[PDB]
Amino acid sequence: SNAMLHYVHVGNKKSPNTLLFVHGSGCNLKIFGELEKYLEDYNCILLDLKGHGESKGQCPSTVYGYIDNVANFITNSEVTKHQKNITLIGYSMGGAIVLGVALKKLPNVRKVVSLSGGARFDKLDKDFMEKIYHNQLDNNYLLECIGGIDNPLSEKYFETLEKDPDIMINDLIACKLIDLVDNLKNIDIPVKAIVAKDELLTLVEYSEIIKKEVENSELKIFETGKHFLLVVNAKGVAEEIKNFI
Ligand SMILES: Cc1ccccc1C
């Protein structure tokens, strides 16, 4: 036995291109269920962060904790330690995490994608975050952020979110605390940000800052999709990963 994070391994396991997926606040690797369908030609590794999905333990309270956990996995897991061309794909809080991992300068991490993410989340809705600080999760606002559950894919994937609300609360507080912006200039590898213009949660402006600050960077703005862009337009998001890796 070992203390490695739980992961799922799918796709073309012999591909020279390894994609390591890192999920976001209050969810788990299940959130990538649609996106993984369009990336089958790659060696896909989907991680559960500590305390999420099948990875046991207390959820770290800071993005720095998650960054250290993910770096430990990359360096030490049998599934990544020998892989020479890793692209990190981080969604939501995972976007900040993969930017933080890029700053660790791991020899085998070659590119990063921040999907509906950011390096700082300073404009999170004040009333929503006040509730979070009072240990209350506004499901109406969460649904608004993902664009509702009328799309059957959205209904399905919304149900994959963690059932204990303490996890979402922990993760949103971690997001309100993180600020990697003034370190983005130190990232040596290519970074691509992908986001929907109609975001209420991970605003397009957060992705514009990533593009501005990282020297070798790309930005794709979809007109619509809100925070469930990776579910309702998984095919389009996958195309915008393929054109970058
Ligand atoms: C990752 C995730 C899932 C559902 C709502 C908000 C967020 C940040």
Instruction: State the SS3 of 136-160.
Output: CCCHHHHHHHHCCCCCHHHHHHHCC
Residue 135 CA to residue 39 CA, distance in Å, equals 37
Query: DSSP secondary-structure letter at 239?
Result: H
Which token pair is 148? 């509702």
Angle at 221 between CA 139 and CA 185, to 5 degrees: 100
Distance 2 CA to ligand 1 centre (A): 29
Q: Which of 21, 137, 142 to mutate to test the pocket of ligand 1 (most atoms within 8 A of CB)?
A: 142
**47 has which bridge partners?**
7, 22
d(CA 185, ligand 1 centre) in Å: 27
Measured from the CA of 142, which atom of ligand 1 is nearest? Answer: 5
* Chain centroid to CA 190: 17
Residue to substitute in 35, 124, 145 for testing ligand 1 pocket (most ligand atoms within 8 angstroms of CB) = 145
Of 115, 135, 99, which is closest to residue 32 (Cα–Cα)? 115
Is the distance from CB of 110 to CB of 187 less than 8 angstroms?
no
CB of 50 closer than 8 Å to CB of 21: no
Q: What is the distance in A from the centroid of ligand 1 to the CA of 16?
A: 31
Q: Which residues pair with 45 in a beta bridge?
A: 9, 20
Of 30, 144, 168, 195, the one to substitute when testing ligand 1's pocket (max ligand atoms within 8 A of C-beta) is: 168
**What kind and span of H or E run contains 168?**
helix 165-177
Q: Which CATH architecture has domain 1-245?
A: 3-Layer(aba) Sandwich (3.40)
Strand order in the sheet with 43-47: 7-11, 43-47, 18-22, 86-91, 109-115, 191-196, 217-222
8 Å CB contact between 66 and 97: yes
Asked if residue 185 lies in contact with residue 157, where contact means CB atoms within 8 angstroms, the answer is no
DSSP-assigned states of every residue in 64-120: HHHHHHHHHHHHH-TTTTT-S-EEEEEETHHHHHHHHHHTTT-TTEEEEEEES--SB
- The residue whose CA has the least distance to atom 7 of ligand 1 is 25
Q: What residues flank ligand 1, with Cβ below 6 Å? A: 24-27, 92, 142, 145-146, 161, 201, 227
* Nearest Cα residue to 227 out of 38, 92, 37: 92
- Extract the tokens encoding 156: 């399905």
For β-strands 7-11 and 43-47, DSSP reports them as antiparallel
Q: Which two tokens stand for residue 150?
A: 């009328």
Experimental resolution (Å): 1.5
Cα–Cα distance list, 40 to 14, 35, 45, 220 (Å): 11, 10, 11, 22
Task: Give which of 230, 95, 68 is closest to 175, Cα–Cα.
Answer: 95
Q: Please, which residues have CB within 8 angstroms of residue 3's CB and are 6 or more apart in sequence?
A: none
The length of the chain, given as a count of residues: 245
The experimental method behind these coordinates is: X-ray
CA distance 243 to 14: 20
Q: How far apart are CA 110 and CA 93, in angstroms?
A: 20
